[PDB]
Amino acid sequence: MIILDKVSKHYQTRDKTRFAAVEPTSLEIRDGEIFGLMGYSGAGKSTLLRLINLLERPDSGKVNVCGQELTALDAAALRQARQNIGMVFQQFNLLSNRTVADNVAFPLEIAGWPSEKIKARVKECLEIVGLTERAGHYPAQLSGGQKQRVGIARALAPKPQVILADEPTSALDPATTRSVLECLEDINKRFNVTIVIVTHEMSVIRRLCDRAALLDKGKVVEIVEVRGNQIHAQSDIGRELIRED
Amino acid sequence: IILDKVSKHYQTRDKTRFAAVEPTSLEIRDGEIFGLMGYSGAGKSTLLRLINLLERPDSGKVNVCGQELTALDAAALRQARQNIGMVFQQFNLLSNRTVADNVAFPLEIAGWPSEKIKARVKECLEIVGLTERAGHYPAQLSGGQKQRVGIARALAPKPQVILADEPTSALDPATTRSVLECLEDINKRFNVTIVIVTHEMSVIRRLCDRAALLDKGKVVEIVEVRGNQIHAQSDIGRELIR
Amino acid sequence: TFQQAVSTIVGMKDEIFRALGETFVMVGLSTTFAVIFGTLLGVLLFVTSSRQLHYNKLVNFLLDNLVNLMRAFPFVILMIAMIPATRAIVGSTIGPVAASLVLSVSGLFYFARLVEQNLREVPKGVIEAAAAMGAPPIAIVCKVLLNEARAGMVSSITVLAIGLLSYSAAAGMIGGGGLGDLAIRYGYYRYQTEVIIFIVALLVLLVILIQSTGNALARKLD
Amino acid sequence: TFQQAVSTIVGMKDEIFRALGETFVMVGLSTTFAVIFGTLLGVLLFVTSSRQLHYNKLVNFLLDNLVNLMRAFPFVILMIAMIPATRAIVGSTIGPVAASLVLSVSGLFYFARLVEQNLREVPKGVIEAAAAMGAPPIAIVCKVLLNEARAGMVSSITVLAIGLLSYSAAAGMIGGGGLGDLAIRYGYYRYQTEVIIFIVALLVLLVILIQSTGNALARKLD
């Protein structure tokens, strides 16, 4: 149940990074539902997802995650909290010089599990995505949809309470995009909550979001509830964002 | 603009992003906007190159605007390539010259007088509404402005055909709507017979007159999107439409 | 300190002004010929690998391997084996000009690799876009490649000049001229401080000056 | 004459073997220290460049300047100026081991430059995920960083080995370094043609063998 409170970021005039600035915003995501951060080319969505994880650090406010105020941890304690918040990336961010079973086993190895349990988990969370038939190959021998499945299966191996997804299926063609989203529905069966999925489009938002948020240049304008695969936006500048349907 | 027949099979060790195409024949009419559609690997991008005959086919004949391009010598082909405007997914525009110079580059190859080159470029910037940024350099423009410069360099030699290699794939919906209206205005005022590759049916519902659905390097069907609703008799066709 | 200053100024003002006069001619006359012939060779290394401007696998293979060999060979060994050939063209085995012939042959192959590397980083699309409008091959290479790699050549000639300065010091001992022919006199025999500190100080300042000039000009054009 | 030439070479049988066995002691011994210390130096350069272990800016500025300066500086001048310091450490100035110490010094800076450029080529996104999974900065430079760039370190070692071979010839004039000393006699003071072609052929063979082994090992690892 992530609750943010007057969080903000601004960058130097150098503006070396692609990420845009975010302005004071408070959002509460419930423990029983999936969320989504709609916007556009600059917007402020990508930095807002990193601010949940403190991979970007705010100038103000408190980031509260799972009942721990993460800006107060400021230590080797923070790198134990980041174990319970997983993440899947747009481009796949997979180690290329080790086999898929090891890519999946890498989070379990990092915590300090004995190898015997690591093997059982690598088997389980790898059959769940339906990829146990390719447990020996290398990322150079897989397709885009398969690489995204490896990312979901790595994200799931720490048994994380929250999974954060950054534009995961935008590159994928429609046939793969349906397969990767169906796998996310399978994840919602077990105790995995708040799968915040960032997207610069609406097809993904209507299909699997329970609630959604909209913005203009770092300022959230309106949060909607997606029922029967529609949106019914009340906001004015918001209506322009929804036309993407 | 007809392909009598064509094919190309890429030899291995070339590892090109392109995929092989098989015995296909097509007839884009005068004034028509015709869309090539298919998932990645359908071979739409390969089919587009074969028209300007950059990629040379293994066999068959390419008839563009009367001339048979396949039998032509290199010096004559350099005129056939000039006759066809092209735009690309990655902008592919020279970075060390100003917005005006990029439009002028095709006109200078054509050995045009320099006073004439000056007159046409101001007119071309006039059409794509970027006259104000004539002196700016291509590292200062947004993604949409870079595409609207690419369309102007394509229309500068007064072409009778344009080819479009999925130009809007990188653009958001708010800028995508403003560049598709430019291809509508160019077709309505000048009859340029534009051809277009894409992986999404949504752009076709916005722009095309007919379309070709490509699967594994062969056409399954030629649909009509003029009615504004794509309708497919086959099974593969009806899957791509969804 | 006056012992260092007095020693340096009186005796060494007669010798230092000769040694700097010999080092600038040894480097200046060699760099010009290396930039003028390395450009041509580096272009041929490229066009015969493009598939567009021209293609010929055999020539590409031969030229590439020859360039690799001549770049990996010890320069000092080549100069001492080339003394009769150098003595036929120059007419004399000793002098800055004689060391200048061997330096130009080593820079020629040295700069032919940098230009090709700079041309390989130009985006492939800008070549396909220029072939789309029927640009003749001699007009692609001249108006596209040598205008896009414009900012990459200047840094390349900055690295060649720093390279042919280090080679010049080695030449001064086998043959003649330079701060290398000065350093053996006050270092290998009669090891003498004061003068060795001055030789070390002058080189650092001159290396910094050439590097600063190269970066500023490259940044302007980019 | 052919038999006169070949008969001459077998007359030098003992000296040639000494030249080779003395060249290997200079290259084979300095490369180990170069790779042991340049690796640490390059890792230190890389970590202070990112948000891993630290983002010091002053330390990175100093270190980056230090390595550029100590690669720009000429090699022959450095050895002549290091005569007393080298003599004190080895107890001698003349000999292959004393010269190898100087070769190792230059090697650490060159290897660090190569390793830093290798590490700076891994995509940041893979390292970004390694931070999201709670791995401490030391774990980052051991499992995430090393696995991705190990295929490129072997190429760096291959280029370094050839780089130090060229320097050995320059130290040959002063340190009597095997083939470099052999080149100075029978090539300058005199000109024994049949023993010059032999040296050139032998060096070409060595260069080819090193390049070929390095390429194969680099290919098998990635």
Residue numbers in the entry:
A (entry chain D): 1 to 245
B (entry chain C): 2 to 243
C (entry chain A), D (entry chain B): 5 to 226
What does the paper say about this structure?
The overall architecture of NmMetNI is similar to previously determined structures of EcMetNI, comprising two copies of each TMD and NBD, encoded by MetI and MetN, respectively. Each MetI subunit contains five transmembrane helices per monomer for a total of ten transmembrane helices per transporter.
With 1 mM AMPPNP (below the Km), the structural analysis of an equimolar mixture of lipo-NmMetQ and NmMetNI revealed that NmMetNI was captured in the inward-facing conformation at 3.3 Å resolution; no densities for either AMPPNP and lipo-NmMetQ were observed. A comparison between NmMetNI and EcMetNI reveals similar subunit folds, with the root mean square deviation (RMSD) of 2.4 Å over 843 Cα atoms. As predicted from the primary sequence, the NmMetN subunits lack the C2 autoinhibitory domain. As a result, the interfaces of NmMetNI and EcMetNI are distinct. For MaModBC, which does have an autoinhibitory domain, this distance increases to ˜27 Å. A comparison of these structures suggests that type I ABC importers share a common quaternary arrangement in the inward-facing conformation such that the presence of a regulatory domain increases the separation of the NBD:NBD distance in comparison to the homologous structure without a regulatory domain Figure 4—figure supplement 2D.
